[PDB]
Design a protein around this ligand. Structure first.
Ligand SMILES: [Zn+2]
Length: 409
């Protein structure tokens, strides 16, 4: 029900029981060889499902709201997917689809928000790379400025992913990475980063977090912990070398901020939506382990401390037991986004255990629509619906190169 679901007390209620046996050499063989390549048999199934889901999607998208051009939910999100598909399959039709969707997303600008997922940066960044790939430096170049100018329209922006500053820097990195050369000046990046550090210590002082955690952030009347709207989101981005936080400030400001977060962990290994929350039940990217894990793995890469890695292992385990949601198959809060957590661990560790788990989740998705889940609100969108699921399946094809999209870097 909508409404009154009794799945309110603890996270086991929100998940189907994971029916897959856990990793061993025999069971792994079927999905990949020792080099961690997917057996052609297995890839064939993925590709076959990908191909067919696209028909459903392409068909459904004929009914999508013409007005919504966002990454999350809107047109730019579909463009994002198609560009990724063109990269994995080489099929020119995908580049043409991507062009067509970008065009739609360009008629949806509102100068309201600065993010990739929910703001105008989505259509802009995505357009810029899409024009680049169609050797069109007229539009692409002009687009880039239109995105550079974009931040001026909200000096009091939040700092999180869906509406905040980092969500804007993603648009910025997207372009840089996909172009090859530094198309956005690193100055433009650092100074926005600077304004998010200083903003984070001011808030921790206006509050008395300053002792407990040198940095603090809030969105819409809460101290959000998770990836979508919260701290793990922000710190992950701050510990990113791309953003270049002085080794100094890195250790004195952000490290213990992160340590604060880790210490919020439930006894289960999961993480509260916000500070003070006592209900341990959301196993999503947006809220819970699946979004917090990116922070842990990065902290490990940056500070090489056993406890970070060790906490991230703990996440994986939670998600293995509880990551098949009755909520559906999506990226934001669904089975597919959850599986990226395994891939991320795998690509740090090389532990084939974690590639294996992704494949078994993938396996759950080849049964898309058999488990009796609710149909998502935008049933074909990147973050709520089918597009993300497809996105993940395609991304799984070359495990080593897989990133959680619009976020991971
Ligand atoms: Zn969500």
């Amino acid at each position: 029900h909508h409404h009154h679901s009794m799945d309110i007390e603890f996270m086991a209620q929100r998940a189907f029981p994971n029916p897959y046996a856990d990793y061993n050499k025999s069971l792994a063989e079927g999905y990949f060889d020792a080099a961690g390549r997917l057996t052609p048999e297995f890839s064939q199934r993925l590709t076959n499902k990908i191909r067919e889901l696209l028909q459903q999607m392409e068909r459904g998208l004929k009914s999508a709201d013409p007005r919504d051009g966002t990454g999350y939910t809107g047109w730019a999100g579909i463009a994002v997917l198609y560009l990724h598909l063109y990269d994995v399959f080489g099929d020119p039709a995908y580049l043409q689809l991507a062009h067509g969707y970008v065009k739609q997303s360009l008629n949806c600008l509102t100068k309201r928000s600065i993010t990739f997922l929910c703001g105008d940066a989505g259509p802009l960044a995505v357009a810029a790379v899409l024009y680049h790939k169609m050797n069109n430096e007229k539009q692409a170049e002009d687009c880039i400025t239109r995105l550079i100018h974009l931040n001026k329209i909200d000096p009091h922006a939040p700092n999180e992913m869906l509406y905040g500053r980092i969500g804007y820097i993603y648009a910025l990195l997207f372009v840089n990475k996909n172009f090859g050369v530094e198309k956005i000046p690193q100055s433009h990046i650092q100074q926005i980063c600077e304004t998010i550090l200083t903003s984070g210590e001011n808030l921790a002082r206006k509050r008395n977090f300053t002792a407990k955690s040198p940095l603090m952030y809030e969105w819409y009347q809460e101290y959000y912990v998770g990836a979508a709207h919260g701290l793990a989101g922000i710190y992950y981005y701050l510990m990113q070398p791309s953003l270049q936080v002085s080794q100094g400030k890195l250790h004195s400001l952000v490290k213990p901020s992160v340590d604060y977060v880790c210490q919020l962990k439930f006894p289960s290994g999961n993480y509260p939506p916000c500070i003070g929350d006592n209900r341990d039940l959301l196993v999503h990217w947006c809220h819970g382990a699946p979004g917090v894990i990116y922070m842990l793995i990065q902290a490990y890469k940056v500070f090489r401390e056993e406890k970070y890695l060790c906490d991230a292992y703990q996440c994986a385990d939670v998600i293995w037991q509880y990551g098949l949601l009755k909520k559906g198959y999506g990226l934001c809060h669904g089975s597919a986004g959850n599986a990226y957590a395994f891939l991320t661990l795998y690509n740090l560790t090389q532990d084939m255990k974690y590639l294996y788990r992704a494949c078994k989740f993938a396996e759950w998705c080849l049964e898309y629509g058999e488990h009796g889940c609710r149909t998502p609100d935008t049933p074909f969108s990147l973050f709520e619906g089918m597009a993300g699921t497809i996105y993940f399946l395609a991304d799984l094809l070359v495990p080593t190169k897989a990133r959680f999209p619009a976020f991971e870097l």
